[PDB]
Amino acid sequence: DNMAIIKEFMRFKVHMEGSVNGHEFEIEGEGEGRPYEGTQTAKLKVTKGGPLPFAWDILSPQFSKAYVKHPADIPDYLKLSFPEGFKWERVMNFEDGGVVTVTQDSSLQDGEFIYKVKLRGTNFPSDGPVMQKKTMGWEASSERMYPEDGALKGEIKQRLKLKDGGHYDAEVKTTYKAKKPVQLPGAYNVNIKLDITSHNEDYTIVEQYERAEGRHSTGG
């Protein structure tokens, strides 16, 4: 019973090692949430390389897909991957040439999820909204999910709000792969809203909230 080890309240720990335009850094954080209700919070701290000379917003989506609410008739592949867990790898292409690639390992250890993240951001224009910290959070997103080659793929057209109006776009593709074969879903969508709920002045201390819910693309 997977419901025995993924409890209705779960905590996690996360460590990110990263570089953006050559600026290296580390972040440590802890989080908690309700995996079957699709809600979670995280508290992050920059532990090396602070303060970051770029927008926090390009990091926020890398800090948890065990906490997606799923209809009973859509296989919750990433919950089912535990206790072993899963890996994911992501490419974000931003409209002005900026690129973020990410790899991640998710495991379950001593009753908590453990997240290890590696991130490389490159080619952000020095006068662009990321390096000038002109972004103001993500609009709600819809990730289109489908199985392919024994893994779960997700595609998103993500939008960052800009301080002086309008948006800054990214196209995102992620592969999520369980460490053991477990049941893949068909095609469906995940509605996501990620909020920065608090931060200190230089974003070395940040709190996030995320709500995510799977919905049918067909039937239902």
Q: Give the number of other Cβ atoms within 10 Å of residue 139's Cβ.
A: 13
List, as one string, the DSSP characters of the chain: -HHHHS-SSEEEEEEEEEEETTEEEEEEEEEEEETTTTEEEEEEEEEESPSPSS-GGGTGGG--GGG-B--TTS--HHHHTTTT-EEEEEEEEETTS-EEEEEEEEEEETTEEEEEEEEEEE---TTSTTTTT-EEEEPPEEEEEEEETTEEEEEEEEEEEETTSSEEEEEEEEEEEESS--PPP-SEEEEEEEEEEEE-TTSSEEEEEEEEEEEESS--
Domain-by-domain residue ranges, the chain?
1-220
Report how far residue 99's alpha carbon sits from residue 93's, in angstroms, rounded to the nearest whole number.
5
Residues with Cβ < 8 Å from 183, sequence gap 6 or more?
75, 77, 80
Report how far residue 100's alpha carbon sits from residue 18's, in angstroms, rounded to the nearest whole number.
10
Cα–Cα distances (Å) from 116 to 53, 129, 172, in that order, read 22, 27, 20
In the numeric block, which tokens belong to residue 31?
């989080």
- Read off the DSSP letter of residue 2: H
| 62, 171 Cβ separation under 8 angstroms | no
> Which of 72, 84, 68 has the alpha carbon at shortest distance from 10?
68
- 45 - beta bridge partners? 28, 205
CA dihedral 28, 34, 36, 42 (to 10 degrees): -30
Decide which of 2.40.155.10, 3.50.7.10, 2.40.37.10, 1.20.210.10 is the CATH code for 1-220: 2.40.155.10
Q: Give the number of other Cβ atoms within 10 Å of residue 77's Cβ.
A: 22
Give the technique used to solve this structure. Answer: X-ray
In the numeric block, which tokens belong to residue 148?
């392919």
In the numeric block, which tokens belong to residue 217?
């693309």
- Read off the DSSP letter of residue 97: S
Cα–Cα distances (Å) from 71 to 68, 111, 215, in that order, read 10, 24, 7
Resolution (A): 1.5
Q: State which H helix or E strand residue 171 sits in.
A: strand 167-178
